[PDB]
Every structure is written in C-alpha cells, then in structure tokens.
Amino acid sequence: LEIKLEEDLTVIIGNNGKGKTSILYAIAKTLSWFVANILKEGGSGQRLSEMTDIKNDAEDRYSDVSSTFFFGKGLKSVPIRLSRSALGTAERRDSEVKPAKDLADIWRVINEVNTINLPTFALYNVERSQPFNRNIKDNTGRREERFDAYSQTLGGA
DNA sequence: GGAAGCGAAAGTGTCGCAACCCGAGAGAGGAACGATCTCGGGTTGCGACACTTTCGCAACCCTTAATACGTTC
RNA sequence: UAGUCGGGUGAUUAGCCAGACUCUAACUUAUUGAACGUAUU
Ligand SMILES: Nc1ncnc2c1ncn2[C@@H]1O[C@H](COP(=O)(O)OP(=O)(O)O)[C@@H](O)[C@H]1O
Structure with missing residues (x-):
C-alpha cells in the first residue's frame, strides 16, 4: 500500500477493519524513532511486532513500513524504513533508521548550543478515554522539565 | 555481519490488598444465659507491577586502495 | 492557486523579470573501481 498524505x-476513511488504525500505528512507530533520537543520542524507538504485524498469508514472512519526511528545500527527503521478520524465521530484516537519527541529532545538538523550537509528535489512539482520577502524586519525572513533553507522547493516551 | 550499550516487546512470577470466614470474648436484655458487635488470625482471588528473556541497532573494516579534473552506479 | 521547467539580469548557489508545463505522483545520489567527458599526452 502507498499513501500520499497532505501537508x-x-x-x-473506510469500513471497519480496512486498516486506518494500522496506518496510524505505523506512522506512530516511525515517529517514535524521531522522538527517541531527540531525547537521547542513538536512542532506540519502537519496532514492528513479529507476532501480529506481519501479514498472516504473506509468502516472504516479513513486513516493511517505509516513510519519507520533508524538512524544507535543504532536506527534501528523510527516508526511514521499519522492518521485522516473522517469529521463527532464520533470515531477519533490518531497519533503515539512520536518516531519522541524523535529523534528530541535528535538532538535539543545535538545541543544546542555542535553544530552538522542537517539533511535536503525538498519537491519540482509541486507548485514550480511560477514566481519570487524580491518582498521580509521586509520578516520577518532573513536568516542568522541557523534554517531559516527549514522555509517552506516542503511546495513544 | 554485528563490539558494547541499551532499550523495546512480550511473557511470567510475586506480592500486597480486598473480601470474606471463623473462633473468642465482654456482656444486652432483664433476671438467667448469653444477643450482638468487635478482635485477631487465617485463606483465597486477583491484578498491577517487577522481573526475565529475546531481539535488534550498527563500532570497526580485517594485510590486501589510489591519489590530473568532473558527473553516474 | 500551488508545484515544477529555465531563457535573462544579478560581485552571482541568494534575490528579481519574461516565458512555459501539470499521468493521484523526483527525493540529485558514489571511489581510488567501471564506463563517459576533459586535460596532459
Ligand atoms: N497480521 C495480519 N494479517 C492479516 N490481516 C490482519 C493482520 N493484522 C490485522 N489484520 C486485519 O486488519 C484489520 C485491522 O483493523 P484496523 O487497522 O484497526 O482498521 P480500522 O481503522 O478500519 O478499524 C482487521 O480487519 C484485521 O483482520
């Protein structure tokens, strides 16, 4: 499948079980690498599942999620591919996540020397809308700290 | 292909909390014996969470390269 | 309208001017090796 998302x-849209949530899930998995490499140098983002993400009746027994990002005329293409081979397959498939790491390295290093505005990556799945009680006191992490805006930002809720 | 670090993803154990049960006990009433509510353990079920295992990113570039100037693979 | 092509000007990778295009739809890449162009030769 190929999509040409607008800027x-x-x-x-579609019927139930047509793959819209799958598309959003794949995009969020792709953006988790940007978030992880903004937070840490060489950080590892989320990866495709080897139990449920590979097509059940695929012959190859691996799945790919390729993406291309645009960051102006000076950086027109940022290709990132997330791949996973099925469980119990001798040949494993690697993920090409280097360009996302490079872009996030640019963001983080430039931000360290001089503060710059950082992009916001957020996913709001069906996993939201759980009840809300004010049960969060010792929640460990410091909410004023600037880089807390990336914490659990692609979890869905 | 894959150091060394590290973290994601998934599975499994564990451990504390709630909910209930069950015997002991002081003693309500009203004229005695012991109702009824509580104290102290004890058991079980359950679910959140800690712990455990596996995978994967990607150093280096091996003895072993050539060195007019430019694109391309 | 975008976006793209690029003839001119421009101390010139920028800015501007004229013109043109539009399959749902470029993202300019890699050496010393191979071939191509060029120079010595
Ligand atoms: N590994 C798989 N192999 C084959 N079909 C799958 C696999 N995983 C999911 N599906 C199918 O893809 C659909 C997933 O639904 P989803 O992406 O949430 O759609 P929607 O947004 O329309 O509700 C279902 O119809 C399910 O049967």
Missing part, C-alpha cells in the same frame, strides 16, 4: 490535513 496540512489528511483524513483516512
């Missing part, structure tokens, strides 16, 4: 707004 400002993209709306995916």
Whole structure:
C-alpha cells in the first residue's frame, strides 16, 4: 500500500477493519524513532511486532513500513524504513533508521548550543478515554522539565 | 555481519490488598444465659507491577586502495 | 492557486523579470573501481 498524505490535513476513511488504525500505528512507530533520537543520542524507538504485524498469508514472512519526511528545500527527503521478520524465521530484516537519527541529532545538538523550537509528535489512539482520577502524586519525572513533553507522547493516551 | 550499550516487546512470577470466614470474648436484655458487635488470625482471588528473556541497532573494516579534473552506479 | 521547467539580469548557489508545463505522483545520489567527458599526452 502507498499513501500520499497532505501537508496540512489528511483524513483516512473506510469500513471497519480496512486498516486506518494500522496506518496510524505505523506512522506512530516511525515517529517514535524521531522522538527517541531527540531525547537521547542513538536512542532506540519502537519496532514492528513479529507476532501480529506481519501479514498472516504473506509468502516472504516479513513486513516493511517505509516513510519519507520533508524538512524544507535543504532536506527534501528523510527516508526511514521499519522492518521485522516473522517469529521463527532464520533470515531477519533490518531497519533503515539512520536518516531519522541524523535529523534528530541535528535538532538535539543545535538545541543544546542555542535553544530552538522542537517539533511535536503525538498519537491519540482509541486507548485514550480511560477514566481519570487524580491518582498521580509521586509520578516520577518532573513536568516542568522541557523534554517531559516527549514522555509517552506516542503511546495513544 | 554485528563490539558494547541499551532499550523495546512480550511473557511470567510475586506480592500486597480486598473480601470474606471463623473462633473468642465482654456482656444486652432483664433476671438467667448469653444477643450482638468487635478482635485477631487465617485463606483465597486477583491484578498491577517487577522481573526475565529475546531481539535488534550498527563500532570497526580485517594485510590486501589510489591519489590530473568532473558527473553516474 | 500551488508545484515544477529555465531563457535573462544579478560581485552571482541568494534575490528579481519574461516565458512555459501539470499521468493521484523526483527525493540529485558514489571511489581510488567501471564506463563517459576533459586535460596532459
Ligand atoms: N497480521 C495480519 N494479517 C492479516 N490481516 C490482519 C493482520 N493484522 C490485522 N489484520 C486485519 O486488519 C484489520 C485491522 O483493523 P484496523 O487497522 O484497526 O482498521 P480500522 O481503522 O478500519 O478499524 C482487521 O480487519 C484485521 O483482520
């Protein structure tokens, strides 16, 4: 499948079980690498599942999620591919996540020397809308700290 | 292909809390014996969370290269 | 309208001017090796 998302707004529609949540899940998995490498140097983002993400009746027994990002005319293409081979397969498939690491390294290093505005990556799945009680006192982490805005930002809730 | 670090992802054990049960006990009433509510352990079920295992990113570039100037793989 | 092509000007990778295009739709890449162009030769 191939998608040509718009710059400002993209709306995916269809029946139930057509793969819209799959597309959003793949995009969030791709963006987790940007978030992880913004937070840490060489940080590891989320990866495709080897139990449920590979097509059940695929012959190859691996799955790919390729993406291309645009960051202006000076950086027109940032290709990142997330791959996973099925469970119990001798040949494993690697992920090409180097360009995302490079872009996030640029962001983080430039931010360290002089504060710059950082991009916001957020996923709001169906996993939200759970009840909300004010049960969060010792929640460990410091909410004023600037880089707390990336904590659990692609979890869904 | 894959050091060395490290973290994601998934599975499994564990451990504390709630909920209930069950015997002991002081003693309500009203004229005695012991109702009824509570104290102290004890058991079980359950679910959040800690702990455990596996995978994967990607150093280096091996003895072993050539060195007019430019694109391309 | 975007986006793209690029003839001119421009101490010139920028800015501007004229013109043109539009399959749902470029993202310019790699040496010393191979071939191509060029120079010595
Ligand atoms: N590994 C798989 N192999 C084959 N089909 C799958 C696999 N994983 C999910 N599906 C199918 O893809 C659909 C997933 O639904 P989803 O992406 O949430 O769609 P929606 O947004 O329309 O509700 C289901 O119809 C499910 O049967």
